[PDB]
Structure formats: C-alpha cells, structure tokens
Amino acid sequence: DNFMKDVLRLIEQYVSSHTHAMK
Structure with missing residues (x-):
C-alpha cells in the first residue's frame, strides 16, 4: 500500500x- 511513498x-x-x- 505505502510502497510507492518509498519510490516517490x-x-x-x-x-x-x-x-x-520544471519551470
């Protein structure tokens, strides 16, 4: 569930x- 928080x-x-x- 919170595995992307680590990737983000x-x-x-x-x-x-x-x-x-990124302007």
Missing part, C-alpha cells in the same frame, strides 16, 4: 536526475 521518495532521486526543466 526514491524517485525524487531518480526522476529528479532526468529532469532539468
């Missing part, structure tokens, strides 16, 4: 690396 967390690490344009 891990994500800020991963998806934030492939993201240099």
Whole structure:
C-alpha cells in the first residue's frame, strides 16, 4: 500500500536526475 511513498521518495532521486526543466 505505502510502497510507492518509498519510490516517490526514491524517485525524487531518480526522476529528479532526468529532469532539468520544471519551470
């Protein structure tokens, strides 16, 4: 159930690396 909270967390690490344009 709360397994994505860890990814959304891990994500800020991963998806934030492939993201240099967030306005």
